[PDB]
Symmetry: C2
Subunit: 114 residues, 2 copies
């Protein structure tokens, strides 16, 4: 179970970083080469980015340059971010738990107080 | 920008982990309380879990105990997995580069044949 969930989570994470990389590049092209910026937007409109790898594999047959730029920027994002995720996520989980627990108590308290 | 991307990535992970927790819980209910297992399943079908936080918040109105069960199991899964993600993601990224590089080489190979046989594609 654990291994399989970890692997599944890594795919989701990588795909999210792929999308994050695509946004950065939408920006960059939104100055440099608007002809390619408009093209990328149209490409996104009809090609899902939910599976980053499938998205990249099909793009590579259509615009290899974009894919390489996406791969490079995704590397920069990954490296700037990966090592913070365990801690930041633990902090967010702890805060989530305290919040739902507080809401849950407010509910029982009202529902017991009358 | 980096901090904002990290913050957003955290929300995505947290929600994914709450989805995973909901599934583990619904399977455990499968033998423990089959009526509650079909109920959770149907609740999942009609309520989006793409934001795990609002999912849990709405669930509170229907079942307080279940929310806590989901939170606790979500912690189990997170602790079992979080520390592996940096390393495994780097491996997965290296593996993606190998696959795309291979694919680029396959395109290059086809272009060399087009050049060698110009304007024909092969032979």
């Amino acid at each position: 179970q654990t291994k399989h969930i970890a692997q599944a989570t890594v795919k989701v994470l990588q795909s999210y970083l792929t999308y994050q990389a695509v946004l950065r590049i939408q920006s960059e092209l939104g100055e440099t080469n608007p002809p390619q910026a408009i093209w990328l937007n149209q490409y996104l409109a009809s090609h899902s980015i939910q599976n980053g790898e499938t998205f990249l594999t099909e793009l590579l047959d259509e615009n290899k340059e974009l894919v390489l730029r996406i791969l490079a920027v995704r590397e920069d994002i990954a490296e700037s971010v990966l090592d913070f995720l365990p801690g930041m996520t633990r902090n967010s989980l702890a805060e989530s738990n305290i919040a739902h627990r507080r809401h849950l108590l407010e509910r029982l308290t009202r529902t017991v107080a009358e």
